RNA sequence: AGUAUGAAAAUGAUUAUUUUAUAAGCAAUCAUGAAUAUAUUAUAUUAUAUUAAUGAUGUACCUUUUGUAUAAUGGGUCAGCAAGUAAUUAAUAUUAGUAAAACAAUAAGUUAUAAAUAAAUAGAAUAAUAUAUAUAUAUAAAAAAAUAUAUAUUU
RNA sequence: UAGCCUUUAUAAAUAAUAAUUAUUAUAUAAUAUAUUAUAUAAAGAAUGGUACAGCAAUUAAUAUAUAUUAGGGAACUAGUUUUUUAAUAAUAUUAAAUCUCGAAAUAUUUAAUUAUAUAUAAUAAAGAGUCAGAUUAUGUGCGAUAAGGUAAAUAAUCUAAAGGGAAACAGCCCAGAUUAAGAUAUAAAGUUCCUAAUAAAUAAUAAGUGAAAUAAAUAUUAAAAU
RNA sequence: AAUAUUUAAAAUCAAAUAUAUAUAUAUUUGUUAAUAGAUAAUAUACGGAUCUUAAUAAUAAGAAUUAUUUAAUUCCUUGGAAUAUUAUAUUUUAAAAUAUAAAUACUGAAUAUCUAAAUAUUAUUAUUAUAAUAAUAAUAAUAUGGUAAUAGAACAUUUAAUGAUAAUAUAUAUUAGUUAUUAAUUAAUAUAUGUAUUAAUUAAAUAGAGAA
RNA sequence: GAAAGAAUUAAAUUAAUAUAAUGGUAUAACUGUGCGAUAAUUGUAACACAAACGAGUGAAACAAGUACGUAAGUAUGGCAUAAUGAACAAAUAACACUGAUUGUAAAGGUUAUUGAUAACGAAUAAAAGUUACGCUAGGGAAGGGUAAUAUAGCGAAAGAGUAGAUAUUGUAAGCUAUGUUUGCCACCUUCGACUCAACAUUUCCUCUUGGUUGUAAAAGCUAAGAAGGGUUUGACUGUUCGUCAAUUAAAAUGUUACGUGAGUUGGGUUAAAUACGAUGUGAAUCAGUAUGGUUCCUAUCUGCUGAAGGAAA
């Protein structure tokens, strides 16, 4: 290994904060998507925008992917997530079966919340 | 109701399927704002690119000209010709 | 190796301005003091020009390579010279001329005007769009595959 | 030659790209134990056999004061018991590139709908170049779970991409330079000084451990929980 | 206290979210540290300086390491409210009371916006003179890194065809201006020439050299 | 209640399939049996799959004829996926198409068939070696990485040690370091001697110290600190190395382009000459042996050794 890819094995505090913020943003996006759908469905039934926003009973999304994203068991929120799953991917060939998320290529775009139950 | 979707991240490190989805959605460059009438189809497409994009719901959409007008900064002066 | 002329450059010496004897690397660019020069509107607290205070950024150029600051190629510098051109043809395209004809006008020819078929004495609505017709295979004649031909004016 | 690139055009043109709907079940309401609507749940039309999971059948491995089949010993007067040797059965437990009876996600992929049209496909007439590739990540073959190794699979970047970060850096993290301007949002990465930018909270460390390239079995000393 | 394990949130408990809801069900989260082991040849090598805080005593420092977090702290549902803080002003006796503010952490690209300029296309205009056009100028949008390659548009140079003009001119050179500038033009200065095969349009090329 | 039939359910594709392996097959594609021996037929084949082209694959339908079946229908070889070869040039037939003045002919064409190019998209009907006498065009189409090996260490301790695993020793298996050996990779196209050495410490000697029923003493053995100083001369060989001789306090191990050829040498390795043994029909060749035998360099910069001038004191 003569070429030096000087990437540290762990993240800095600032990196971790940015990661957390990114995770929070994707959860927010999902929430907005569900909310807009609900609003649209209220309008279809025949309420005003404000009335729809007020509504006690929020409509859950019927499409599959959205419904999965809503579930925390499948796609957890940043507040829900463990410290470890925020900053460590599962890597079967690593010692500890764990690897920094920053070592994943395009980790800033690519999402990866859920690790295996005991790894 | 309308999703105001914004292409927050670039499409440089992004695979070709996700690029194609972004193109279909209508977003060109980074930070290129697009309003979309809400429906299941557009919602699912947005979910598919959830990490590149910032979405927020709105009462009304805006045409490109309106958006431009909103953007324009205040010229702090009033011309008086003589 | 003509004759005039020659502030063309490389190159040498000298003078002037400016910087330089505690500072380290493509010697430039950008920031920015100072010094000097020029300026018949510097009215100035001015403008331009020249100059390695000081600060920041800055790994020659080409070639060949997956990849070159490379200790890979090539160049001492400047001046001059040094590389997709012609002929005879064929196919496309664009325009222009003429146009069911064109070129040529002495005739002759080339292309077009009919599609086929290895080739032969075969060759396009019997009452209309293919469901008709022509050709090649086949045949008594159709059907069948293929391509072509037809819905005031021929293309 | 095809693949990928370019130019000029053609339409009784959206055929392209992306997603949704499509299914199953439950509850409620309305009609005729069925149908429709609404809401919710379910990795949700069709195709599949990798991961995972599993030991079924196949191929392999282990154990039985268990049973049967024979054999070798052994005690009394050929019969009999025990300590057994293998095989077979029974029961329990295990694994495999060429085992999958269970089984994902990603994937392949169809209709209509919506969204992309200052956008795509297809076709027609013409021009190319290229066929030494590299690294990173993931899943493998070879190698020794060695190589800046080698061989291909998928994605990205470099190739041909300047800019910010990673001390310096082809391939990593961001992000694509038409020309400026420099007020505002920022990305990745940073905020004691060098060096543009910082203040806090709660724990732990005392080894300069560490502070952007994490060195192992094991040992000692603590600390919690039982 | 002693012996022996484990270093765990599966179970268990605690806390939080979602469905009927003072409870039940389902989901999500929470379970050690230090040292030794330790190791080669130009020179210490976190990039370097340097970084573990300390009362008296500061209008003042107290990780710049590791782990979990925040953008002053605490409740309620990004937002408001309360709480103290900090700074400031006022009033009263260096303190107290009242009130105003700050709470949007910041840096950061050739990213995006704004601000202007250019070209190209699409869609609207305006002005001036296939007028369903051309030129120029507006507005909105999209696009403009590029090797191999493809396509489009220009300029310099030399010759041929046509061709005014003139030493107050032309050409070449130097210096300083000008025009979004390989080019040309203005002025000054110099040297030549009684003068552009000149401007412009065509036709062509021994038509552009830091790379053999 | 009994007999017979029709059968259904469960299981099975582990047998069998002309043939490998895989998929399929009991609704059988497997097996038996009647007829038959035909469809192991003739012209057009769309449309798909696959696909650079050349080819390859499945195939509806139309037309002619055939075999089986009461009929429905089925058959254009085999349950499927291998069982193969272009043109050119010859050859054989059929076709009635051309017939170089006309007629015949020849010769060519169409249709069907024939043999191989296995380096198997086949260059020709037909082609092996050698060069250290070689030549031209190009390409690189010890250092670096690795650490299997090697060297060193650590953990655990079977076992030796008169008794006791751990004074000293330490099987096989375990965890590391090193980049000193032999390899592997292919980014990257000279051994020894002399001379002068610089550096490391994993210490051979000298200094300090722990352990040593195996430290009585003296010699040792083993371990910790320690790089200040020191660490060989000869015979043999080109040798480093090694064997020995004589010494020494000791004759340590490396790194430095296995330091040092613009500093020396040139014995080894190395081309031209020649011979020998072996190999080859031979030219010639060799992880062979032997004699002979070719590079040079005035120092520009860095650096170092000395010596001046200038200077800001
Ligand atoms: Mg000085
Ligand atoms: Mg110097
Ligand atoms: Mg050099
Ligand atoms: Mg060079
Ligand atoms: Mg040279
Ligand atoms: Mg016929
Ligand atoms: Mg090609
Ligand atoms: Mg469609
Ligand atoms: Mg497999
Ligand atoms: Mg299965
Ligand atoms: Mg290749
Ligand atoms: Mg490689
Ligand atoms: Mg290239
Ligand atoms: Mg770059
Ligand atoms: Mg690119
Ligand atoms: Mg761009
Ligand atoms: Mg340290
Ligand atoms: Mg480090
Ligand atoms: Mg739990
Ligand atoms: Mg060091
Ligand atoms: Mg640092
Ligand atoms: Mg920009
Ligand atoms: Mg371009
Ligand atoms: Mg020329
Ligand atoms: Mg020249
Ligand atoms: Mg040039
Ligand atoms: Mg079988
Ligand atoms: Mg296909
Ligand atoms: Mg084909
Ligand atoms: Mg059969
Ligand atoms: Mg058979
Ligand atoms: Mg031949
Ligand atoms: Mg004749
Ligand atoms: Mg061949
Ligand atoms: Mg071949
Ligand atoms: Mg060949
Ligand atoms: Mg041959
Ligand atoms: Mg010889
Ligand atoms: Mg013993
Ligand atoms: Mg051993
Ligand atoms: Mg090495
Ligand atoms: Mg030592
Ligand atoms: Mg003694
Ligand atoms: Mg001393
Ligand atoms: Mg040497
Ligand atoms: Mg030398
Ligand atoms: Mg040298
Ligand atoms: Mg002699």
Coordinates of C-alpha atoms (C1' of nucleotides) in Angstrom, one line a residue, chain D residues 59-150:
Chain D
rU59 C1' -23.2 -35.7 -0.4
rA60 C1' -20.5 -35.5 4.5
rA61 C1' -19.5 -35.4 10.4
rU62 C1' -20.6 -36.7 15.8
rA63 C1' -22.8 -39.1 19.9
rU64 C1' -25.7 -43.0 22.5
rA65 C1' -25.2 -48.8 29.9
rU66 C1' -31.1 -47.7 23.1
rA67 C1' -32.6 -51.9 19.4
rU68 C1' -31.2 -55.6 15.6
rU69 C1' -27.6 -58.2 12.7
rA70 C1' -23.3 -61.4 12.8
rG71 C1' -17.9 -61.8 14.9
rG72 C1' -14.1 -62.0 19.0
rG73 C1' -13.4 -63.1 24.0
rA74 C1' -15.9 -65.4 29.0
rA75 C1' -18.6 -68.3 33.2
rC76 C1' -21.6 -72.8 34.5
rU77 C1' -23.8 -77.6 32.8
rA78 C1' -24.3 -77.3 22.3
rG79 C1' -27.5 -73.7 25.6
rU80 C1' -26.2 -68.2 28.3
rU81 C1' -24.5 -63.6 30.1
rU82 C1' -21.4 -59.6 29.8
rU83 C1' -17.4 -56.5 27.9
rU84 C1' -17.6 -55.3 23.3
rU85 C1' -16.0 -55.0 17.1
rA86 C1' -18.3 -53.1 12.7
rA87 C1' -22.8 -52.4 9.9
rU88 C1' -28.0 -51.1 9.9
rA89 C1' -32.0 -48.9 12.4
rA90 C1' -33.9 -45.3 16.1
rU91 C1' -33.1 -40.6 18.7
rA92 C1' -30.4 -36.0 19.3
rU93 C1' -26.9 -32.6 17.2
rU94 C1' -24.0 -30.4 12.8
rA95 C1' -22.3 -28.2 6.9
rA96 C1' -21.9 -27.8 1.1
rA97 C1' -18.9 -23.3 -5.5
rU98 C1' -21.3 -27.4 -8.6
rC99 C1' -27.5 -29.3 -1.8
rU100 C1' -32.1 -25.7 -1.5
rC101 C1' -38.0 -28.4 1.1
rG102 C1' -38.3 -22.0 3.6
rA103 C1' -36.9 -17.4 1.8
rA104 C1' -35.6 -11.1 1.3
rA105 C1' -34.0 -6.5 -0.5
rU106 C1' -31.9 -4.9 -4.8
rA107 C1' -33.4 -6.8 -9.8
rU108 C1' -36.0 -8.2 -14.6
rU109 C1' -40.6 -6.3 -16.1
rU110 C1' -46.4 -5.1 -18.2
rA111 C1' -50.7 -2.0 -19.0
rA112 C1' -53.1 2.5 -18.1
rU113 C1' -52.5 7.1 -15.4
rU114 C1' -49.7 11.3 -13.7
rA115 C1' -45.0 14.1 -14.2
rU116 C1' -40.8 15.4 -17.5
rA117 C1' -41.8 18.5 -24.1
rU118 C1' -37.0 25.2 -24.1
rA119 C1' -37.6 16.9 -23.0
rU120 C1' -37.1 12.0 -24.7
rA121 C1' -37.4 7.4 -27.9
rA122 C1' -37.6 5.6 -33.2
rU123 C1' -36.5 6.1 -38.2
rA124 C1' -33.8 8.3 -42.7
rA125 C1' -29.2 10.4 -45.0
rA126 C1' -24.2 11.1 -43.8
rG127 C1' -19.0 11.8 -40.7
rA128 C1' -15.9 9.8 -36.6
rG129 C1' -12.7 8.3 -32.9
rU130 C1' -12.0 4.1 -29.7
rC131 C1' -11.0 -1.9 -29.1
rA132 C1' -3.2 -0.8 -23.7
rG133 C1' -7.4 1.5 -19.4
rA134 C1' -6.7 3.1 -13.9
rU135 C1' -8.3 3.7 -8.8
rU136 C1' -12.1 3.5 -4.9
rA137 C1' -16.3 0.7 -2.6
rU138 C1' -19.2 -3.9 -2.5
rG139 C1' -19.8 -9.3 -3.9
rU140 C1' -16.4 -13.3 -5.8
rG141 C1' -12.3 -16.6 -8.9
rC142 C1' -6.8 -17.3 -8.6
rG143 C1' -3.0 -16.2 -4.8
rA144 C1' -1.4 -17.6 1.2
rU145 C1' -9.1 -14.3 3.4
rA146 C1' -0.5 -11.9 0.5
rA147 C1' 0.6 -7.6 -3.3
rG148 C1' 0.3 -0.5 -5.7
rG149 C1' -0.9 -8.6 -7.6
rU150 C1' -4.1 -11.1 -11.2

